[PDB]
Every structure is written in structure tokens, then in C-alpha cells.
Design a protein around this nucleic acid. Structure first.
Ligand code: MG
Ligand code: MG
Ligand code: MG
Ligand code: MG
Ligand code: MG
Ligand code: MG
Ligand code: MG
Ligand code: MG
Ligand code: MG
Ligand code: MG
Ligand code: MG
Ligand code: MG
Ligand code: MG
Ligand code: MG
Ligand code: MG
Ligand code: MG
Ligand code: MG
Ligand code: MG
Ligand code: MG
Ligand code: MG
Ligand code: MG
Ligand code: MG
Ligand code: MG
Ligand code: MG
Ligand code: MG
Ligand code: MG
Ligand code: MG
Ligand code: MG
Ligand code: MG
Ligand code: MG
Ligand code: MG
Ligand code: MG
Ligand code: MG
Ligand code: MG
Ligand code: MG
Ligand code: MG
Ligand code: MG
Ligand code: MG
Ligand code: MG
Ligand code: ZN
Lengths: 81, 129, 150, 155, 87, 144
RNA sequence: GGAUAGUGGCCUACCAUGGUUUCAACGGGUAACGGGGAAUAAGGGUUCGAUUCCGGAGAGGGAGCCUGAGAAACGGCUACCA
RNA sequence: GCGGUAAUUCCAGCUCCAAUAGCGUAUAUUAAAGUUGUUGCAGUUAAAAAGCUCGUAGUUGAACUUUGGGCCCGGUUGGCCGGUCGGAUUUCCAACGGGGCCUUUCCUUCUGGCUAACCUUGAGUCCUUGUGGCUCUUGGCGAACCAGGACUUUUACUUUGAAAAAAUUAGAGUGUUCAAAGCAGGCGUAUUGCUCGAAUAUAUUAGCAUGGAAUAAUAGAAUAGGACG
RNA sequence: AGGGGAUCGAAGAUGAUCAGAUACCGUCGUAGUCUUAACCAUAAACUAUGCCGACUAGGGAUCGGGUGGUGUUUUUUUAAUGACCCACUCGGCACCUUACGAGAAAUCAAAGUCUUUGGGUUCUGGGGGGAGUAUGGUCGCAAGGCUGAAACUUAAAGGAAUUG
């Protein structure tokens, strides 16, 4: 306070903020390849679905819509990319 | 709704100075803010500044020295008539030996003294001292 | 902000800086435009496509991997509705509220809401109308609005 | 307004002293006169190609255009062969050092060489008093129709 | 504040706050001038010889007196990792 | 901005609102309604000459006990009837009923003077002369 | 078309339904002739101008007209009213 | 606010003040008044936020589209020098301005008429070892504007200029004895005449004319009825 | 205009009190209080404090939403839930402490960023009475609402704070 680097804010105090009040704004959601080992292939899901994402071939389920982040269902794995 | 993007940057700058800060971050920048920002800096009322680039309208960080008591904005951009530029400075500048009334003329955003030397006039928007 | 209320809810999507890529995104322009159509070919609103394409697929935002906005893709493929979907969804709403008020002439609150919903309509219509997307002298009237939707 | 008929009065409509001798078998039935108004205003072809009479036409009739040249925006095309335009302008009020929107309507004749319609911007020319109120004559349409043709059915 | 010819007319050119470069006037009896000590080898502390800093009454009232001095002294090379320009 | 439109074309509203609000000014409204020419016992004129009906003995307002001595005058251009005061010691002995007198205002712009209730004018001359001069002795009251 | 010195609803005949207006029309008030200008002196203003110059209007009130280049004249005439 | 028995306010004498050939009073208005507020007011409790929301007129309205860099010309103050018998010009130095080039860059446009200007050059050079210098025709600059055709998205703002009655106003010259004024007057050979004047400024809104291209509007190509040929 | 009409209860009637007592207190109790279909449009309808936008300063609570946690508790076999705990973040109803600052003060995170006087816009006030009166218009079944003067009078009326 009184003199600080507004141009190079620290990654943490930057990280804790709001998605619009960061330096330059950008999302804080993410995508993921997801597999329920009944099948073999990997469907790409949105961390904040809304739509209860219907799996590829087997209409099994996958995730459920929520407040924000989707709840993935039962026995499933992932990765953020 | 946001009404004069100049007004906000200017006031920010002033509130910072007043509270003893050295930097503002202003939002959302424009051609005009820069040109205004540039004019103050030319006579040293602020340090350097940086345009950061949100893929939007922009942000600006200004560095303040402390040499600045006031930078105001003239809210309706009145026409001034080369004769009437005198009447403005008189109204709202501390003395005749320093401070500038800045204004937008056909041939560029410029403080009144430059405007005098170049023999152009136009609309008025703000001031520094 | 918040035009017909006192709400101050700052709250939107934070669209990404990178106006291209994902690069870990395969597919193609080709790939998703065909995908855009069939869903609107099933009748889906461009937003519904937007949500649908976002989750199940990896459409981060349709414009970025196909230089054009969803509604514009549709207009090209001869698909766009007779009226914009937002204006559509207001009219549909003012219908259901009216239908209610007719059935509940004792519900002053609804009468109030109807006003708002309509005065939001007529302002929107006036925008669209100014900018040629509607014919001049297009007009929302209660009498013939339950027509316009269903 | 003119439209059709043309020989539609109690009197026979003709251009004065433009005589067509019946003895000389002609291929144009009517010799027709016209001028160039000047000030670089094109006499439109519909003036020459036409067959309307209108003595108040600045290209086919007996009026000189001289004085003010004015441009306004069409507001009324209700009266046969003359229109009324609105001349908007902002008026400066010193004590407050600001302005206020003002306007004036100006009635002006309009030759059936032009086909004008409400909304069009029109350049008009000062002439001798043509009627009780009219002192101008319409001399170029700047406008068109205001993008009307791109207002058809659904895609 | 000179004059027509040279001559430094008008007395008294006041101190400015080391932290804000604002004037430190007379009735500002809440402003402060700190002397930090020049020293030599193996402790010791060269009397009369100080590196000095001046802080406005405003600043001290606002609580920024410490922090701001932290910066000032440190980037004069007499504090060794205490401050941080980023936050 | 609190209130007043700041804009560059808002000059009409800015004049209108001023026209409007001037009416709350006392002397502007008096002036424009023509309150002078209409009310007011004089014309709107500086003085007026009337005729003396009865001689009055107006008792003064508190905390002042006295008897103030006045004249009911009937203005000649008017027949408007008016009570007026007769300054300085005596002087009432100068007037008499049916006399001509010159009335002037009291220098309160309308509004009565001191402890004299009701009186808004004062005498200046009588029978042609000058009350003041008769008081001194520079002049004398004309025959009839 | 007539009338005028001549444009023009100026007037007439036919025909049409137009013209103005919250950007204040239309109506009312004015102890209103307009202007150059006058008074008040930080500036911005506020108030005033019957009245030495320019324009306009009038000759007790209305209308009418003769003469003439020029008047709808009044130190011209005609009629009515006072 | 004084006066109801010692009246610093009345009625007088004395003495004293202010302005003075003039001074009082009445009415109006102007200043004081930021108590009408554009500049520039006030509205929790002093006068003053409509019970509440919608809303047309009206006012207002986010950001972004030729910017940066390179070359050339010639001005106007001022400096250190003055060449010269108070002010002068070259080069030395800055500073502030104007113009015109090239950078992917309409300058409305073709068809001759004009050329003033160099990439030219046709010779050589007054003369400081020479790009310091201008006259100088036979291949090669357009726009500087002629005049005829063919056509031009709209505006606000600001610039400079023309058109402009006098008296008034501001203000130069002139010793009406001073001055308010007036536009006079001034010099001699005062014997046959010589001569300076009768400025300048303002004149704003509107209309005209010209330069600018920031600020703020406007119009453009999406069912292509697009743009050049 | 119907229905309803327990309760409480303008009016009225009474018991008392009082010099009086048309009241305060006690009793009876009409209308009313509730509801339907229409009116009326006013309250200290109050935060006595327009709305949209920006900026300026600390602190602990709480309400709704969300994110993070090899947190606690629930046992069953660990999870999954749920409630709870901690950190942060939006948007709420408020409080605390300061005051850079504002104010005539009382006080005020707005009543701040105003003689260093201009973000946009709406509305109202201009000494006190006369008086929200008169008059005209308009709305209402009415009661009344909206609009709303002047003559005349007057040197104060008023605000916040201090000492009594
Ligand atoms: Mg709104
Ligand atoms: Mg917001
Ligand atoms: Mg949301
Ligand atoms: Mg017609
Ligand atoms: Mg009032
Ligand atoms: Mg009497
Ligand atoms: Mg009379
Ligand atoms: Mg006719
Ligand atoms: Mg009709
Ligand atoms: Mg009005
Ligand atoms: Mg008159
Ligand atoms: Mg006048
Ligand atoms: Mg006059
Ligand atoms: Mg008169
Ligand atoms: Mg006459
Ligand atoms: Mg007479
Ligand atoms: Mg008559
Ligand atoms: Mg006569
Ligand atoms: Mg005569
Ligand atoms: Mg005595
Ligand atoms: Mg005595
Ligand atoms: Mg005495
Ligand atoms: Mg005097
Ligand atoms: Mg101003
Ligand atoms: Mg006030
Ligand atoms: Mg109050
Ligand atoms: Mg309120
Ligand atoms: Mg803008
Ligand atoms: Mg000019
Ligand atoms: Mg002159
Ligand atoms: Mg009951
Ligand atoms: Mg009773
Ligand atoms: Mg009793
Ligand atoms: Mg009773
Ligand atoms: Mg009320
Ligand atoms: Mg309350
Ligand atoms: Mg806080
Ligand atoms: Mg959780
Ligand atoms: Mg008193
Ligand atoms: Zn599966």
C-alpha cells in the first residue's frame, strides 16, 4: 500500500480474486477427457456442464448439472486438457 | 451508465495523488485518455504509464510523482473561440505563469499554450496544474 | 445495471484472451459447422447449440474455431427464425403470464410483471426494427402473440 | 403525384410556343423542350424522356433557379406535385453557451421528373414565388428509399 | 523562485516528504525527519554522519510511515530483503 | 451533478427552468404582473396629489405610546382613498380639510414605516407650497 | 383565367384534401413601434431604448378616390361616425 | 431603536462632521446578490426529492479503423558575434512554428491547355583543394488552375477572409488658456504660400468565402440487388 | 351493492371523577372491523436523504450463490450424502472503529472526491404570515384529489449546538 506493482501482481493474491477482477480477465473453468471403463474411448467434457452429458455409444450417464461444477458419476477418470 | 471515459481516469488520478499513492490503474482507456495522459507527462505531472491489453477496451497503469495538485475534466466539451481561450485559463488556472488548459483542436489534442503557438482552437476538455 | 429492477449482479462469462486455438482441439471448421446445422436442424436455439456443443464436445466457443457466430452460421444455411430468439423468448413469456392473469384477475403482482415484460419487448422490437432485421411497422400485440409462438 | 392521364385537365396541356406542325409527318408526336438549370445540377432523363407538362418544372418549365440552394429531409408527400421538408438546425444561446434543436418546414414544388418519398433527402433551389407558400423547387434527390428493398419475406 | 534578473527572491524553500514529494510546511508539526546512521567497519557508527529521510505529517497519520520507510531505506541499500514491490 | 442538465444542447431546458423559477422572485413577479399599475394607490408614479378628507389621530404601535397625526386623502387621478402621515412637530396645524396635498411614498418600497400602522405615504406639500418650508418660515400658506 | 406595374389563393371557376403543432402551434397579455444603441464597470450578466441617425406606421376614427412619375396623400377631395 | 424629569436620538442655542454650487426626499432600476446560480446556489434536521415502478417527448450515451519512422524547403523571434558610417545581413547555435515528399497511402475524374518545379543536362564554372552557385536549350514532375465533359454520402466545431453607415464605444494625432468638446491645425518670405491630418479597433448570431480533419454525429457490403474492368 | 357480522369498537347512551368534564377511567353498543364486485388515491406512504456510472478506508458478524480442503462429526466396511469448521470470492440486510474528507453543527463510507467550483440525467425550494386560502380547470357518488394565485400584513419566523 502507497506504492506497489500493479503491473506484476503476485500469482496468489492474483489467484484468489474474482474471474473479472484479475489483471486481464479470463475463465477459471476447464475441459477434461473422460472415460467410464465400460467403454474404451474418451469423451471431452466441460467442468460446468448444465447438460447431463450423454456418453458416446452407451447412453450410460456421465456427469450431472449442479450449482457450478458438474458432478461426475460413479466410476470415472479424467485429465485437464 | 458510463458516460465520459476521460472523466473517470482523471478523477482516479486525482484521488490517488490526494491519498498519497504513486500508481493508479485506470479503466478503460481510449485514444483520448492516452493523448491527455501524454500531455500531462510532457510537462511532468505523471511518470510513465503502460497500456495493458485486455482483449477489450484496455486498462492503463499510471505512475505518479507528486507534482500534481489537480487534473480536472470539462464535462461538456464547449467550443472555445481563440479569443475565449484566455477567459478559460483565467477561470480555472492558479496563475498566469504555469499550469495548462488542455483542449481538442482540429490539429490535435494539445495544451492551450501549444494551441496558442500553432494558431488553432476548438473544443475544451480538461486541465492540469 | 439490471434494467427493470434494482439488481446489481456483476456476473458474466469471462471469455478467454486467446482468440484462437485450443491447439489440443482437433476437429476443424468443417467438423463443427456440419455439427451446428443438424442440431438447429433438430430445432435447437443457437444458445442451446452453444451449451450443447460446449459440454459434450470441445466447442470452447463456436466463433473461435469457425470465424462466425452461431446465429450467422444458421442464417447462411437458411435456418434463422422469423424473429430473433431473445425477442421470441420474451413474447413466449408474456404469453404465459397473460394466460395466468386471465385466470387470476385478482393477481395484481402479475399485472405489474406483464407490463415490465412487454415494455422490455416493445423496446427490443424497436431496436431490431431500427436495424432492418424486422419490417418497419412490426408490432407486438397481445391479441396476436399467442399466434406468434404457438 | 401526377401519374398517368397527362391530358387530364379542362384545358389542353402543352409547352408554350413548342409547335408541332401536323403537315410534317414526325416520329415523336410531340416536340418537347428542356433546359439545363445550371449550378451543375443534372437535368434528369425522366425530364427529357417524360411527357408530363408542369410549367413549374425547373428543367421542362418556366422557372429560373436562383438564390438559396438548401437541402432538407422529406416529411410530407401528401400534396400533389409539391412536398414539405424539414430543415433541422441547432440554435446557439449565449448566456448558457449551449444550443437547442430547432427546425422549420419549407414547402417546395416537385417535378414529376423526380419520384420522391417520405424520408428522402432532397436538394432544393430557390425560385420565384410559385404559390402562396412555396419558394423552392427540388433539383436533386440525395437519398434513395432508405434501404427499403432489403425488407422482404423470411429466409 | 528567482526574479527578473537572477536574484533568489522569496525566502525559504521548504522540505519535501521523502515519500510523497509534497511540501512539508510549518504548522505540519506532525511530520518527521529520521536520521539513519552511516557506519564503518566492524560495528562502529560514524557520528554526525547520517543518511536522512523526511516523512510528511499526512503520511504518518495515514499509518504508512513504517512501510514507506521500509521501501526508502531498503532501496538505498540499507535493508536486506524486508520489503516487496509486488503484492 | 445534482440536478441542472449539463449537456451541450440542453440550453432550452436551461432557459425554461430559469424563466420558471424567476417567478419566485418577488420584484420580478411584481414587475411582470404589473402590480404597480394595478394595485398601489399611486399610479406606479413617484408621488400623487389628493384631497384632504378627515384629519386623523393614529395611535402608534407598541412599545411606543403616542398619537401619530395623519390625513385621509383621496387621490385626484383616482378617487382611491388613502391615509397619510404629516411629519415634524405641529404641521397638522398647517393642513385643514378639503385642501390639496402632495403625497410621496415612505421609502420602504410599499410597506408602512415605524409605529404608524397602516400609513404608507407622507405629506410633502399643501395648498401649493411645501410643508417643510411652512415649518421653518421661508413661506406662507396661500389665501384660499 | 381574370385582375396587377408585375410574381402569388391576390381574386374567380373546376378539382383535390391538405397546411401548423411539446423543437410550444393556435389563443391571451404587453403601462411593445423595431434597430443603431443607454445605464450598471472582475468576468458571466441584469435592466432600458416615446426620444437628435436608419427603417416602419399615422395625421380625431374608419373606408373611398381624384391628380400624378410617385399618394390609397389628409396643412387633397368624397361619404359615414364622433 | 429613542421619549414615562439628570433625553448622547425629540424642540432649540452652542460647538462638531460629510459632500459643497449644490445637497435632501419619493419612485424606478443596476451593483452589493453565489438571495435565480451557464460561469455559480440550495433541498437528512433551516424553504425544497413526486408513495411507488413503467414509460413517450427531451437531454445523455463504453472501447476500436493512418499510426510510427525517413527525407526536403523556406519562414520568425532571440542569442554570441557587426560588416557599418541608432540597425543591418551571411554563416555558428539553439526554440517555436508553416509547407511539401517517400514509406502498400485519391489528389473526384478523364480529354489539352500552363507548365513552376528536377531524377534531368547541355556546355562549363565567378571562385575558399568543391555539389558552397545562377544564368542556361533537345529525351524526362503535374495538379498551381485554366474550360468542356463525366460525378460527387451527410453535418456540427474551429480557423482566416470578404461584405459591411454614420453618431455612440475603445482608442492615435492636435496644447479648445484648462477641460467637457471639436476635427482641427501647423509652418514661413506673415507682400500675392508652404504643409501633417481628418487613423485604428469592435462590429459576436445568421448568410457568404477559405484552411484544418482532433472531438461528436451521419451514410456504406449480409437473402449480396455488392466493388472495380 | 351483496354476504358476513365472534371480536374489538368513531357515534350515541350511561357509572363515576371535576368548579365544570361534552373527555381521560368503567358499562351498553350503531357504523366499522372480515369478504366479493366496484370506487377513493391519501399517511411522519420516513432512511424526513432521486436514479445510473467511477473513485476514495479499516474490522469482526450474518443471509443467498460458488470454489478450494489426504478439515471435524454422522459408521457400516470405508466411502456417497447431510449438518458443522477454516480460507477466498461475488451479490444482500445491517453493525463496529476511524477519518484522509465533508458540515452551521448534530453527524456523515456518503451527507466524501466543491472558490483547486463541470461524469449523465430527473424533480423541488428562494424571508415569515396571508394559505394550500380565493379563482378557473379537471377527476370523484360523496368525502375529497390534482393543478393553484393575489391584495394586505410583518423583522423576523427557523436550524444545530452551549450555558443556565
Ligand atoms: Mg430504467
Ligand atoms: Mg455494476
Ligand atoms: Mg448470471
Ligand atoms: Mg392534394
Ligand atoms: Mg410558491
Ligand atoms: Mg378612516
Ligand atoms: Mg385618467
Ligand atoms: Mg392556382
Ligand atoms: Mg378537410
Ligand atoms: Mg413552454
Ligand atoms: Mg403601444
Ligand atoms: Mg423595447
Ligand atoms: Mg426607438
Ligand atoms: Mg408610449
Ligand atoms: Mg401616410
Ligand atoms: Mg389630437
Ligand atoms: Mg371597423
Ligand atoms: Mg387619408
Ligand atoms: Mg403632410
Ligand atoms: Mg434638563
Ligand atoms: Mg438635554
Ligand atoms: Mg441637537
Ligand atoms: Mg450623493
Ligand atoms: Mg460556461
Ligand atoms: Mg440560497
Ligand atoms: Mg424541512
Ligand atoms: Mg423519496
Ligand atoms: Mg464515444
Ligand atoms: Mg470572423
Ligand atoms: Mg469608426
Ligand atoms: Mg359488528
Ligand atoms: Mg360520548
Ligand atoms: Mg356526567
Ligand atoms: Mg359528545
Ligand atoms: Mg403527500
Ligand atoms: Mg421513520
Ligand atoms: Mg468496508
Ligand atoms: Mg464445499
Ligand atoms: Mg421591533
Ligand atoms: Zn461410457
Amino acid at each position: 500500500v502507497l506504492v506497489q506493482d500493479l503491473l506484476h501482481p503476485t500469482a496468489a493474491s492474483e489467484a484468489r480474486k474474482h474471474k473479472l477482477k484479475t489483471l486481464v480477465q479470463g475463465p477459471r473453468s476447464y475441459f477434461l477427457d473422460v472415460k467410464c471403463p465400460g467403454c474404451l474411448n474418451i469423451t471431452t467434457v466441460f467442468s460446468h456442464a448444465q447438460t447431463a452429458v450423454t456418453c458416446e455409444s452407451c447412453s450410460t450417464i456421465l456427469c450431472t448439472p449442479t450449482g457450478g461444477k458438474a458432478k461426475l458419476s460413479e466410476g470415472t477418470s479424467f485429465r485437464r486438457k | 451508465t458510463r458516460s465520459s471515459v476521460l472523466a473517470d481516469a482523471l478523477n482516479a488520478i486525482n484521488n490517488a495523488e490526494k491519498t498519497g499513492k504513486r500508481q493508479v490503474l485506470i479503466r478503460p482507456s481510449s485514444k483520448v485518455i492516452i493523448k491527455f495522459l501524454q500531455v500531462m507527462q510532457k510537462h511532468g505531472y505523471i511518470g510513465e504509464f503502460e497500456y495493458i491489453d485486455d482483449h477489450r477496451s484496455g486498462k492503463i497503469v499510471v505512475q505518479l510523482n507528486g507534482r500534481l495538485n489537480k487534473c480536472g475534466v470539462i464535462s461538456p466539451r464547449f467550443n472555445v473561440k481563440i479569443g475565449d481561450i484566455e477567459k478559460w485559463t483565467a477561470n480555472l488556472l492558479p496563475a498566469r505563469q504555469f499550469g495548462y488548459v488542455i483542449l481538442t483542436t482540429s490539429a490535435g489534442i494539445m495544451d492551450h499554450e501549444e494551441a496558442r503557438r500553432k494558431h488553432v482552437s476548438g473544443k475544451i476538455l480538461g486541465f492540469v496544474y | 445495471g439490471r434494467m427493470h429492477s434494482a439488481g446489481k449482479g456483476i456476473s458474466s462469462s469471462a471469455i478467454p484472451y486467446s482468440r484462437n486455438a485450443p491447439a489440443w482441439f482437433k476437429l476443424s471448421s468443417e467438423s463443427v459447422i456440419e455439427q451446428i446445422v443438424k442440431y438447429a436442424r433438430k430445432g435447437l436455439t443457437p444458445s442451446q447449440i452453444g451449451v450443447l456443443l460446449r459440454d459434450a464436445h470441445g466447442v470452447t466457443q463456436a466463433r473461435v474455431i469457425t470465424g462466425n457466430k452461431i446465429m450467422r452460421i444458421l442464417k447462411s444455411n437458411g435456418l434463422a427464425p422469423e424473429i430473433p430468439e431473445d425477442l421470441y423468448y420474451l413474447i413466449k413469456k408474456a404469453v404465459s403470464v397473460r394466460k395466468h392473469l386471465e385466470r387470476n384477475r385478482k393477481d395484481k403482482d402479475a399485472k405489474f410483471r406483464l407490463i415490465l415484460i412487454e415494455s422490455r419487448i416493445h423496446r427490443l422490437a424497436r431496436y431490431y426494427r431500427t436495424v432492418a432485421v424486422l419490417p418497419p411497422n412490426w408490432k407486438y400485440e397481445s391479441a396476436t402473440a399467442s399466434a406468434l409462438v404457438n | 403525384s401526377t401519374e398517368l392521364t397527362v391530358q387530364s385537365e379542362r384545358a389542353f396541356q402543352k409547352q408554350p410556343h413548342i409547335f408541332n406542325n401536323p403537315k410534317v409527318k414526325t416520329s415523336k408526336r410531340t416536340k418537347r423542350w428542356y433546359k439545363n438549370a445550371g449550378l451543375g445540377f443534372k437535368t434528369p432523363k425522366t425530364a427529357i424522356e417524360g411527357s408530363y407538362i408542369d410549367k413549374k418544372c425547373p428543367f421542362t418549365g418556366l422557372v429560373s433557379i436562383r438564390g438559396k440552394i438548401l437541402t432538407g429531409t422529406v416529411v410530407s408527400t401528401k400534396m400533389h406535385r409539391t412536398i414539405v421538408i424539414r430543415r433541422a438546425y441547432l440554435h446557439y444561446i449565449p448566456k448558457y453557451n449551449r444550443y437547442e434543436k430547432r427546425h422549420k418546414n419549407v414547402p417546395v414544388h416537385v417535378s414529376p421528373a423526380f419520384r420522391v418519398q417520405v424520408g428522402d433527402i432532397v436538394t432544393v433551389g430557390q425560385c420565384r414565388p410559385i404559390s402562396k407558400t412555396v419558394r423552392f423547387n427540388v433539383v436533386k434527390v440525395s437519398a434513395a428509399a432508405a434501404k427499403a428493398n432489403k425488407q422482404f419475406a423470411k429466409f | 523562485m528567482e526574479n527578473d534578473k537572477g536574484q533568489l527572491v522569496e525566502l525559504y524553500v521548504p522540505r519535501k516528504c521523502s515519500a510523497t514529494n509534497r511540501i512539508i510546511k510549518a504548522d505540519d508539526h506532525a511530520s518527521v525527519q529520521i536520521n539513519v546512521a552511516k557506519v564503518d567497519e566492524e560495528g562502529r557508527a560514524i557520528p554526525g554522519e547520517y543518511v536522512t529521510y523526511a516523512l510528511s505529517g499526512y503520511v504518518r497519520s495515514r499509518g504508512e510511515s513504517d512501510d514507506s520507510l521500509n521501501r526508502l531505506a531498503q532501496n538505498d541499500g540499507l535493508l536486506k530483503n524486508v520489503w516487496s514491490y509486488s503484492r | 451533478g445534482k440536478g441542472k442538465p449539463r449537456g451541450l444542447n440542453s440550453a432550452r431546458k436551461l432557459r425554461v427552468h430559469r424563466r420558471n423559477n424567476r417567478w419566485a422572485e418577488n420584484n420580478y413577479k411584481k414587475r411582470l404582473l404589473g402590480t404597480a399599475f394595478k394595485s398601489s394607490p399611486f399610479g406606479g408614479s413617484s408621488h400623487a396629489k389628493g384631497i384632504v378628507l378627515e384629519k386623523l389621530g393614529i395611535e402608534s404601535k407598541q412599545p411606543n405610546s403616542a398619537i401619530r397625526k395623519c390625513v385621509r386623502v383621496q387621490l385626484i387621478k383616482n378617487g382611491k382613498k388613502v391615509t397619510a402621515f404629516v411629519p415634524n412637530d405641529g404641521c397638522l396645524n398647517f393642513v385643514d380639510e378639503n385642501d390639496e396635498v402632495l403625497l410621496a411614498g415612505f421609502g420602504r418600497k410599499g410597506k408602512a414605516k415605524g409605529d404608524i400602522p397602516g400609513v404608507r405615504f407622507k405629506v410633502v406639500k399643501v395648498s401649493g407650497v411645501s410643508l417643510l418650508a411652512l415649518w421653518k418660515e421661508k413661506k406662507e400658506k396661500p389665501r384660499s
